[PDB]
């Protein structure tokens, strides 16, 4: 999270760390959308051109998570996938589309003050909210500055929060040069806007949950996918249309859990 601030105990109880066992480490984050189901970027699980490619066994998942360092002794969680599930029309090849993947928590987690689910949109909500200028908040433990490295300026101690506006679809196609599909959306203030923040390295898979003024709920409007850097006056992150693909999302849940 480029230009953001440190979280607070309980403010995103659905943020999970995609921590591989050994090289004991963290590739990303995801979100709690069931008793036992977690969803994320696909790039976060299957990237060939960098021969990224994991399996249940490969990874282990953690929850209850505030400090990105330690061992959250009795507020944190962890279980390993029972099965990972990607989306059979994903473009790691072209622009990384349908950048979505889900994982049937090998076993089920029981929620608390520190672990609690996120709800998925409905065209209604998918549509009152997914609009130019209406901010959304992105979290994680990702890289405080463009791909570089420092318990400082590299990565945070604790969980990073940023809230960003949606970008007029036109303007979005003119930050990049990548063939952007009606399935991806862009966040982040303008050059001129005079304020900055963004999502960075290992922020990926990390959520784009917004809050619906109708029912005071938190709706995972997005899923972190890409950028051409970190906090460029001139570009906007690109997130996944969690609702466009809400279709699929359903099928695998209702067919394997």
């Amino acid at each position: 999270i480029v230009e953001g601030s440190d979280a607070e105990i309980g403010m995103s109880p659905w943020q999970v760390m995609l921590f591989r066992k050994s090289p004991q480490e963290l590739l990303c984050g995801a979100s709690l959308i069931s008793d036992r189901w977690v969803l994320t970027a696909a790039h976060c699980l299957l990237y060939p051109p960098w021969d990224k490619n994991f399996t249940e066994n490969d990874l282990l998942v953690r929850i209850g998570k505030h400090s990105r360092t330690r061992y959250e002794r009795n507020i944190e969680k962890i279980s390993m996938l029972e099965k990972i599930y990607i989306h059979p029309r994903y473009n790691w090849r072209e622009n990384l589309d349908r950048d979505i993947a889900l994982m049937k928590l090998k076993k089920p987690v029981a929620f608390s003050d520190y672990i609690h689910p996120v709800c998925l949109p409905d065209r209604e909500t998918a549509a009152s909210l997914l609009q130019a200028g209406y901010k959304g908040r992105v979290t994680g433990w990702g890289n405080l500055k463009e791909t570089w490295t420092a318990v400082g300026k590299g990565q945070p101690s604790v969980l990073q929060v940023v809230n960003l506006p949606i970008v007029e679809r036109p303007v979005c196609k003119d930050s990049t040069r990548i063939r952007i599909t009606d399935n991806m959306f862009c966040a982040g203030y303008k050059p001129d806007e005079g304020k900055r923040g963004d999502a960075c390295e290992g922020d990926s898979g990390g959520p784009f949950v917004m809050k619906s003024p109708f029912n005071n709920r938190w709706y995972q409007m997005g899923i972190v996918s890409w950028g051409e850097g970190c906090d460029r006056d001139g570009k906007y992150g690109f997130y996944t249309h969690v609702f466009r693909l809400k279709k699929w999302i359903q099928k695998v849940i209702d067919q394997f859990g």
């Binding site: 790039h43 990702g142 791909t147 390295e201 990926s204 996918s225 850097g229």
Partner: peptide
């Protein structure tokens, strides 16, 4: 291509 990119990470 994830967000720091083409070429692989640092």
């Amino acid at each position: 291509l994830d967000p720091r990119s083409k070429y692989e990470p640092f």
